[PDB]
């Protein structure tokens, strides 16, 4: 009779613990499966966040390394006030990354490519036919540092060689 | 004068000084970051370790049974289209053309070595075509005829029929359903 | 250079905009423990009772399945042990992994 | 099986890696042999298996690296013996040694790098030997062969 | 879980399970006569899905269970340390952005 209890309680053990615990690991370890993918890709982009600790909490600590390299310089022992490159070099390499925001926007190169450190604004001015007062075609307004690109980017969806109503800012009125 | 140079003194000196101190403390923070990340994925070895257990004989049983009712279709006699969808559920909704007409053509495409050669794949694709025509009337009933169903009856019943594609035939059944007045 | 002399507010506040981009990295960090630790709490509570049911196997069905033969008789073990001189003398690859090793 | 590891350097091919048809039965047989506690024994046997197989494949590349065939041509004179590829496949089979050996675990196990000592300390002695061989053909004369020593530096 | 999809007929590719798709259907049933003589071998492949299926079913719930303990326990303690590290990151941009606008405010005083 205890062997009958082995058939009942132990068929419940193998059959019911295997099938019921098969539901526990099937559904619940399916939640651990998809949630394991969640913490998996979260671990990957978390390692990209650790890369951002190198890409920002070390890169701006490289900016801080130049900063306390200049307070570490402290070479007055007033004309050593050029303590930044990122006053020129990374500031016109950041503003030459506005020649890469320019060169991306193109946004000269096309053939001016001189000085848009602050390529200071862009707008969406659908232009007007100035005589009749009706509308003209649309135009991106590319107000660079010292030259204007009133460019009809239609149907020039780039922003590579768009219609450049252009001049220099020093006599733009 | 030294108001401006006082901005150079406090701002430059304190900015450089607490820039190095706060950024170095931030480097200690990044040390705790990779610490917890290393202990995290190191604790996440049991994830993959348990995750090898995806015993896809379930896939061999839905696939073996897919071969089975596929052969029920492939007797040219798969009349198991419970009417006609089956109604309100065949996967969760109308799936007589979803799991089966795509198995009428894709299991018409299921060539083992010879396996009921292209005499059978054509008329099996004509079961994909009859169930495709009733599928067109089905999602047409879902969204083109209703056309009053702001609920899932247009939305998640044709989108329950979103294993079938080509919804600009349904927009064709919007210039023939909703712009039919137009 | 020729006119850019006020670069501290713009390159440094742009570096503070980069620190505002690194404040967006702190949104990636609060997002990091948010999404990742959310998967931790969610899968954690999601599979703790899976460890209670795997524990129901691993405590109750474990020593229950062990003490099946708590008393078990004398001749029958010779019978089916001799039938494991049938099956254990079929080789490994005929019999199979937990077939062979579980008969062991 | 044995093979020239240069064939996996000439053709640059990925190194042999056992797989799960074994490995489930392998680790199963291991912790199975930690109920039986003889996983240490079959472990030391396995150190036998792969250690000797590295003596087989690395018995192929004993040939072109025991002999540094450029003795005194200019003196040095080519940069072109085979202790480089010797040490190359030595480290790469140290690599798939490291992975493929230290895969198969119920994760916490003590002797896993001690296994790596059991397999590679003789191969440490193998590099120490052929390190001896090129250490003495590049010996007894500065500029024998004296610049070529730097590639030995490379290898070490 | 990971089942109950449409799956018909994804990867058409009849998989030749015991080559019963190859033997009965694709070698004695080549031109759509059979599968009626082969449909018996398909139901026989369903009994083989109960014996192959029972065989894999034995090995299905077989690997258990010791322990994946610090999966849950280190998920808990590492989750609390994840909370404290998140406090270190929010604190990090707290004092960091505090200094950024602080000396960008004294640097706006340099403006």
CSV table of C-alpha atoms in Angstrom, one decimal, chain D residues 30-31 33-34 37-47 97-121:
chain,number,residue,atom,x,y,z
D,30,UNK,CA,32.0,15.7,-13.9
D,31,UNK,CA,29.5,16.7,-11.1
D,33,UNK,CA,31.9,12.5,-10.6
D,34,UNK,CA,31.6,14.9,-7.7
D,37,UNK,CA,34.3,12.8,-6.2
D,38,UNK,CA,36.6,11.4,-9.0
D,39,UNK,CA,36.2,14.4,-11.2
D,40,UNK,CA,39.6,15.3,-9.9
D,41,UNK,CA,40.8,12.0,-11.4
D,42,UNK,CA,39.2,12.2,-14.8
D,43,UNK,CA,40.2,15.9,-14.7
D,44,UNK,CA,43.8,14.9,-14.4
D,45,UNK,CA,43.2,12.4,-17.2
D,46,UNK,CA,41.8,15.3,-19.2
D,47,UNK,CA,44.9,17.3,-18.5
D,97,UNK,CA,42.8,25.9,-23.9
D,98,UNK,CA,41.6,28.6,-21.5
D,99,UNK,CA,38.1,28.9,-22.8
D,100,UNK,CA,37.4,25.3,-23.8
D,101,UNK,CA,39.0,23.9,-20.6
D,102,UNK,CA,37.5,26.5,-18.3
D,103,UNK,CA,34.0,26.3,-19.9
D,104,UNK,CA,32.8,23.1,-18.4
D,105,UNK,CA,31.8,24.0,-14.9
D,106,UNK,CA,29.3,24.2,-12.2
D,107,UNK,CA,30.6,27.7,-12.0
D,108,UNK,CA,32.5,27.8,-8.7
D,109,UNK,CA,35.3,25.2,-8.9
D,110,UNK,CA,38.7,25.7,-7.3
D,111,UNK,CA,41.2,24.0,-9.5
D,112,UNK,CA,40.2,25.6,-12.9
D,113,UNK,CA,43.4,27.7,-13.2
D,114,UNK,CA,45.2,24.9,-11.3
D,115,UNK,CA,44.0,22.7,-14.2
D,116,UNK,CA,45.5,25.5,-16.4
D,117,UNK,CA,48.8,25.1,-14.5
D,118,UNK,CA,48.5,21.3,-14.9
D,119,UNK,CA,48.2,21.6,-18.7
D,120,UNK,CA,50.4,24.6,-19.4
D,121,UNK,CA,53.3,24.3,-16.8
